[PDB]
Design a protein around this ligand. Sequence first.
Ligand SMILES: *[C@@H](CC(=O)OC(C)C)n1cnc(-c2cc(OC)cc(C(F)(F)F)c2)n1
Lengths: 106, 236, 84, 792
Amino acid sequence: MDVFLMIRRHKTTIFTDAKESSTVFELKRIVEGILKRPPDEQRLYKDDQLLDDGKTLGECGFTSQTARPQAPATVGLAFRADDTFEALCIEPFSSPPELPDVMKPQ
Amino acid sequence: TLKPLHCACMVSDADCVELLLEKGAEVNALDGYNRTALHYAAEKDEACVEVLLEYGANPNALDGNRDTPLHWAAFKNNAECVRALLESGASVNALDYNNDTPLSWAAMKGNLESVSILLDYGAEVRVINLIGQTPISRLVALLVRGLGTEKEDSCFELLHRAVGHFELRKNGTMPREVARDPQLCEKLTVLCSAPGTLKTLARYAVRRSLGLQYLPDAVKGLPLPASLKEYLLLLE
Amino acid sequence: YVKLISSDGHEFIVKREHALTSGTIKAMLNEVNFREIPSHVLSKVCMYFTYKVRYTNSSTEIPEFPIAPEIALELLMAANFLDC
Amino acid sequence: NAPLVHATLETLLRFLNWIVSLKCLTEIAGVSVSQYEEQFVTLFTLTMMQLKQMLPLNTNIRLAYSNGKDDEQNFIQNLSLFLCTFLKEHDQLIEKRLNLRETLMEALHYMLLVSEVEETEIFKICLEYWNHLAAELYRESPRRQLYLPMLFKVRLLMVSRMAKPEEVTDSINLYKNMRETLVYLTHLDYVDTERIMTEKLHNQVNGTEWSWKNLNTLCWAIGSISGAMHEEDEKRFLVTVIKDLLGLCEQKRGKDNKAIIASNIMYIVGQYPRFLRAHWKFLKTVVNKLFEFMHETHDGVQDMACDTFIKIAQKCRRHFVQVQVGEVMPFIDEILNNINTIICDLQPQQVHTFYEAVGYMIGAQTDQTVQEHLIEKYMLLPNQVWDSIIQQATKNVDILKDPETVKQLGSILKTNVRACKAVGHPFVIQLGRIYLDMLNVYKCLSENISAAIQANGEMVTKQPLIRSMRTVKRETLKLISGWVSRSNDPQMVAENFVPPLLDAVLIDYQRNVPAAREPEVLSTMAIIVNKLGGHITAEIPQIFDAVFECTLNMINKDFEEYPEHRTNFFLLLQAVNSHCFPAFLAIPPTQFKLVLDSIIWAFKHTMRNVADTGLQILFTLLQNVAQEEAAAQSFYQTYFCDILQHIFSVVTDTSHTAGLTMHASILAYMFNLVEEGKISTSLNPGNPVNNQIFLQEYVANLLKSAFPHLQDAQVKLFVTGLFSLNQDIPAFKEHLRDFLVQIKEFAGEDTSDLFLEEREIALRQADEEKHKRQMSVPGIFNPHEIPEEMCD
Ligand SMILES: *[C@@H](CC(=O)OC(C)C)n1cnc(-c2cc(OC)cc(C(F)(F)F)c2)n1
């Protein structure tokens, strides 16, 4: 029914929502709304896989159970520049600090 | 049906049990009812409990139904006895034949001192017995019975803060006995509906990670502000 | 759309209403910047905001928030700084 | 020789009353003489020393008695008797002798262990001694310092051996003594006894000593102490006990174990109305749990649930009608809404119990209209069933011959009777709703039973159908009697209910066969006349015409034929003679003569109650007739001599010692009445003569006939003294008693029977003093018997 996503690029992240029946085109249009870069200059990548605009989101690797709000499914985003698509540069989040000894599992 | 140590603990005389163990009495010997002298000591007096533990007694000695002495100490509300047992190496998550952890019994009776002491040692509030009564469910039933005073209300507050989040509804319906108390039903519905503040969830995760330790001592080692330490110890 | 910045360079953009869940955010509130929150903690916080708005006033069972032990402490500190 | 020595010892035992070894010592302390204090002290010391020499206290004397033969068993029994008697009479002597404190300690230690023995005689003696001790110590407010370290064992024994309460003869007395001792002991120390009950209940939860008998005795001990503690301590203790028992119910498994636990808790909550009253929410939960229980299959739990529901309804009537905190509508409305489902699977007696409880609950609705609607809903189901029956009868009258229909009507009317008993006057609406059809069905059933008797005879009265219809008529009359006794509008009853009631009842009573006449008719007429003092005065003559003529003959011949009919007839006659005396004069004189004959018979035969009622009716008739001059002279000249002679005749026989005071009273009244000339005519119709002198000579002749052996002078002086003292009732009675004593002495006969009348009254006053003394200490009387509802 409801799918919760996470669009990322370099150090930028976007939180949104959609529907399984919804196509990739409307997700691209939301990308426009937040970033204002024409859709033809935007291509979405899931775990290093290309996504088609006309292909429905539901038939893609996303489901309500798979994309619960507490664990959204990351989606790669790349900006097309000077008539070519940039590399899928995704910046991983900072590593968590080392676990303190007292809290360490016994 | 009981050895002299059992009777000495029944009368709750620490001196008699001490002098009896000084000559080498079999402390862990079982009696007819499948009880151990520690079970009797843990129902009456803390001094007897300490004296008995001084001689290598098993704080996990299982009774006929696997009710460890901690279970009886909690049920009787002997806060000092419960503290003495737990500090001595008792299993704060010990399960009897019905999977009734001592916290479940203490909540069932509703007493507060024992529940606080247990939670200080890391008792798991999410424990479910075989029938399916969480400590919070039993305490809420007791409150619905109308026997709940400010003590029981404070105990419920402690449990609710510790559990992090609890959902009493059966599917979409609350238990029948709750449904007949409209104001308490409203309070429980509002408490259950809310997802819960992020801070409480994080506190519960930290407590679970620290579990099975004297939490105040453990948290003292953490680098957080003293306010957040008090928050972790369920002071807010 | 609200814009959030972590202590280290990371831009989190969430929907306006969701960011309003935090009292500190609402009091502060176009661009909100943080000097202490690391990126992973902030992503967890955004997850929490989405979860909170989604499951508020729910009737069915409420799924539990998954917190890894290592980030639990930092997440608690961040939530305490905020008002959620 | 030895046999002669034993015979001499037995003779000494026999003669000690007026002038087996322990028996001689047992009666020594019974002298009750303050002198010889040092002696009495000395005897105790030597006896117990020898006892200890031949029987140390360390011995488990319980087992010795269990295995001991008769010779030693009697030894311990007499030992206990002597110790208990001497202590009850001389414990004060020993206690002040601090030099012999060890003697008292050993004596009480012996006392504690002997009570362990289970045989009823020894335990009863020990319980009597313990109750006396508890009463004595409580009388201080000094002395408890002497026994306080040992009183604990007394509490353990008392709670341990608690008898069966009559809410779950020798048993009654044992229970009363147990309760009094227990309440005294708890009044001595609340903390220790509360701790003891809590410890025993825990041990029951602990798994040790789980025997059902232990649970039941502990719960009886807890329940019987109701009201002995202050409010707050009661709250705490009862909360702890409820918690522990609920914990037991979950722990234990098996309907057999569940059922026993349920009965215990229902009994405990049945007591302590105060606590249940203060905690509204707990009361609601309790009532809901009872409603759930009523569908329970096990009979004992269900019956106990209904009984406890009665107990709760009686002491908490108000709370169910007022709107309580946190509630929208009063709980009575909720209960009335779900009445159909709750009562299901209850036996008819249980349904009557439940409706009686509800009626008690509706009786607190002070607001008129609210109570009106509450009652209209309350009787909705019984009334609709009744209307269905009435409609079916209207279609055809034959539906009254169905045993099922008659049984159902009896059930409905029994429910109505219980409802009227609980509610009271406001019930008139329902009674006003079903009254007409009630009397119509009464008439139809009476006609049918009459036809059955006529066709068959008096044997058919045993048939189930006939006895069921008689039950229906009995219930109708009981309902009317209850309402009228509880009614408060004399004019309304005199106007609406009386005429149809008389029409339906009186003629049928006269016409039926003697075996098919219900004394409830007489009871109801007595009730209605007693209430409506004057308004019934118009209809009295037909009542006496239809009822009195037939009933009188039915009773006089045999004194054991209809015990109830005679009592109800005498009650009716007394009530009419007390509240409608002007009616008699309007009656033809033959009926008055019949009434006088019946009254004369009433005090002739030896039945005590009948004699008392007859004498009272005669005295009241003498008092009342003095206010009607027109017929007073005729009544005097006709019956005065006859009644007077009959009174001597019964008195001369001395067969009614209890009524002798009444005999003297009426004799003095008659002597005074004739003395002052109110007679207004000569006692001899054929010739004038001094009425006083005629009375003197007549009584002298009658006494001579009764006692020919007596001389003229004695009779003359006796009558002279008696007639003079007519103005003083005590002096008249004293003179009559002295004369009778002199007659008995002349005949050489005992006169104790005369004195029994005085000492029975004396011991009645003693019993009243004992009763009121108990009321001083709270808790000796159980809450559901004291007449204190507190309107809350
Ligand atoms: C346990 C289950 C039960 O009712 O078993 C019977 C055999 C059906 N149990 C026993 N008695 C109670 C109980 C609980 C109450 O809670 C307030 C109140 C009562 C009451 F009868 F005294 F009202 C009884 N539960």
